[PDB]
Amino acid sequence: LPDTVDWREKGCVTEVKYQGSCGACWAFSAVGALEGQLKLKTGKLISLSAQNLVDCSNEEKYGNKGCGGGYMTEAFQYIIDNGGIEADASYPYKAMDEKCHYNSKNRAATCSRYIQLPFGDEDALKEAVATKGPVSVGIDASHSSFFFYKSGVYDDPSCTGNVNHGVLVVGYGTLDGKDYWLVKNSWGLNFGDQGYIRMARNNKNHCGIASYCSYPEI
Numbered sequence: 001l002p003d004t005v006d007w008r009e010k011g012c013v014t015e016v017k018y019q020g021s022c023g024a025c026w027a028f029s030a031v032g033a034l035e036g037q038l039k040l041k042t043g044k045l046i047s048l049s050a051q052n053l054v055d056c057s058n059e060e061k062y063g064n065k066g067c068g069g070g071y072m073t074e075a076f077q078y079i080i081d082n083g084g085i086e087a088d089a090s091y092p093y094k095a096m097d098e099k100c101h102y103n104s105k106n107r108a109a110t111c112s113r114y115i116q117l118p119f120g121d122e123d124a125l126k127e128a129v130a131t132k133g134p135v136s137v138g139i140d141a142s143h144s145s146f147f148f149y150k151s152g153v154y155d156d157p158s159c160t161g162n163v164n165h166g167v168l169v170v171g172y173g174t175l176d177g178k179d180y181w182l183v184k185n186s187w188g189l190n191f192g193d194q195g196y197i198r199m200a201r202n203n204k205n206h207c208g209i210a211s212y213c214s215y216p217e218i
Ligand SMILES: *C(=N)CNC(=O)[C@@H]1CN(S(=O)(=O)c2ccccc2Cl)C[C@H]1C(=O)N1CCOCC1
Pocket: 022, 023, 024, 025, 026, 063, 064, 065, 068, 069, 070, 071, 072, 073, 137, 138, 139, 163, 164, 165, 166, 212
């Protein structure tokens, strides 16, 4: 496995999005991972519709609750079941719960299956990020050191394994002798380091980052 990986280098990451008031982190994380796979397979870098997931996967079958929150694995299950997802250009982001208006004529991507990585296994998350592409993860993102992060490696001892926020791992590395995960957030460009955060890697599943990892397969 390489020492440093950053999928932005291979042009497999879209622009950082802003979820606003809607609790759609799980939908941005899911689309982020699928965008990665879409680029690696087709050569197309397209921002996929988080709104398509928010409106259409809000059922008993999935357990997604739109702006009330949801799961990356279930967003992937919706794409498999639906036979596709639209691009953000045809199904724009509203930051509200709306009635489903999916149109297969504007389908931009498909998904055949998703892979779940072993709970709390940082070594398996590292292999997947390096060899498969960006990975959807859950983190405890509830502490002020996370919200007000600006640089360096985020290594807060008040962080817990009690995850509450879906993000996207787009890489890893080591900064000033501290291993990190390169995380793409959905809180706009004005969060962290241009929408990104470097979070402690190999530090006992810090923030529960390796607890609930998944990535789709086209
Ligand atoms: C994001 N803006 C709001 N947070 C959520 O939507 C979270 C995302 N997850 S998670 O905590 O990352 C997670 C936990 C356990 C297994 C897998 C994952 Cl991805 C869950 C979701 C959430 O808070 N809820 C509570 C309300 O019902 C839907 C799920």
